[PDB]
Enzyme design. Sequence first.
Site, PDB file in Angstrom:
ATOM      1  N   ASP A 180      84.076  -7.717  -1.426  1.00 36.71           N
ATOM      2  CA  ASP A 180      84.021  -6.650  -0.433  1.00 36.71           C
ATOM      3  C   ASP A 180      83.383  -7.079   0.895  1.00 36.71           C
ATOM      4  OD1 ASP A 180      85.059  -4.764  -2.314  1.00 36.71           O
ATOM      5  OD2 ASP A 180      83.008  -4.206  -2.965  1.00 36.71           O
TER       6      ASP A 180
ATOM      7  N   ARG B  97      81.578  -5.238   5.711  1.00 39.10           N
ATOM      8  CA  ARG B  97      82.292  -4.615   4.613  1.00 39.10           C
ATOM      9  C   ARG B  97      83.743  -4.381   5.021  1.00 39.10           C
ATOM     10  NH1 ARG B  97      84.832  -2.450   0.886  1.00 39.10           N
ATOM     11  NH2 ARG B  97      83.953  -1.236  -0.810  1.00 39.10           N
TER      12      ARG B  97
ATOM     13  N   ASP C 154      88.427  -1.597  -2.330  1.00 37.13           N
ATOM     14  CA  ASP C 154      87.361  -1.694  -3.315  1.00 37.13           C
ATOM     15  C   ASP C 154      87.718  -2.753  -4.362  1.00 37.13           C
ATOM     16  OD1 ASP C 154      84.750  -0.799  -4.261  1.00 37.13           O
ATOM     17  OD2 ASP C 154      85.897   0.404  -5.738  1.00 37.13           O
ATOM     18  N   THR C 155      86.942  -3.840  -4.422  1.00 33.12           N
ATOM     19  CA  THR C 155      87.135  -4.893  -5.422  1.00 33.12           C
ATOM     20  C   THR C 155      86.247  -4.578  -6.619  1.00 33.12           C
ATOM     21  OG1 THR C 155      85.398  -6.373  -4.561  1.00 33.12           O
ATOM     22  CG2 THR C 155      87.690  -6.763  -3.784  1.00 33.12           C
TER      23      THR C 155
ATOM     24  N   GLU D 179      83.351  -4.921  -9.460  1.00 37.43           N
ATOM     25  CA  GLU D 179      82.054  -5.597  -9.484  1.00 37.43           C
ATOM     26  C   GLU D 179      82.091  -6.920 -10.288  1.00 37.43           C
ATOM     27  OE1 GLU D 179      80.241  -1.951 -11.124  1.00 37.43           O
ATOM     28  OE2 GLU D 179      79.593  -1.488  -9.059  1.00 37.43           O
TER      29      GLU D 179
ATOM     30  N   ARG E 248      76.101  -2.278   7.592  1.00 32.17           N
ATOM     31  CA  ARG E 248      77.193  -3.227   7.452  1.00 32.17           C
ATOM     32  C   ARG E 248      78.265  -2.876   8.475  1.00 32.17           C
ATOM     33  NH1 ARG E 248      78.640  -2.673   1.106  1.00 32.17           N
ATOM     34  NH2 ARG E 248      79.233  -0.720   2.009  1.00 32.17           N
TER      35      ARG E 248
END
EC number: 3.1.31.1
Length: 129
Positions: free
Chosen positions: A15, A29, A34-35, A37, A75
């Site tokens: 991310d 960011r 959304d990758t 975790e 970010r």
Amino acid sequence: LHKEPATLIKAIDGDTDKLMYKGQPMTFRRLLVDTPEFNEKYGPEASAFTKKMVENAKKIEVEFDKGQRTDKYGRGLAYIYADGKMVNEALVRQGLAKVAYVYKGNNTHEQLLRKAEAQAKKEKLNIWS
Ligand SMILES: Cc1cn([C@H]2C[C@H](OP(=O)(O)O)[C@@H](COP(=O)(O)O)O2)c(=O)[nH]c1=O
Ligand SMILES: [Ca+2]
């Protein structure tokens, strides 16, 4: 939208990356993705994919959208390009990220990414396998 220069300071995860922008270090960011975790399926693969793209690039660029340029964590929010290839899009196209966090005003490339996700899903890549 406009691409601006930046230099890689350090690849972080699927991310985020630490980039030098206007001569200042900043965590960026990636918009609209959304990758998983690191502890989640395909989490390590996502970080590996972005690490290679950003590390191997001769030229990193950042592209802000029309809305917020920084999130509540400080970010930077941008589209990130490696030798003119968008990392955000590349992740989604390979099934290593889902389209996500689509807020009005910061969604210029939403349809492009959704098309990529549709293809990844049809090809049953990675998170869609
Ligand atoms: C991608 C993105 C995230 N964020 C915030 C929403 C989330 O708040 P919460 O931390 O309260 O869940 C968080 C998700 O980022 P991560 O997926 O990196 O955790 O970052 C934004 O505000 N704007 C964005 O464009
Ligand atoms: Ca994530």
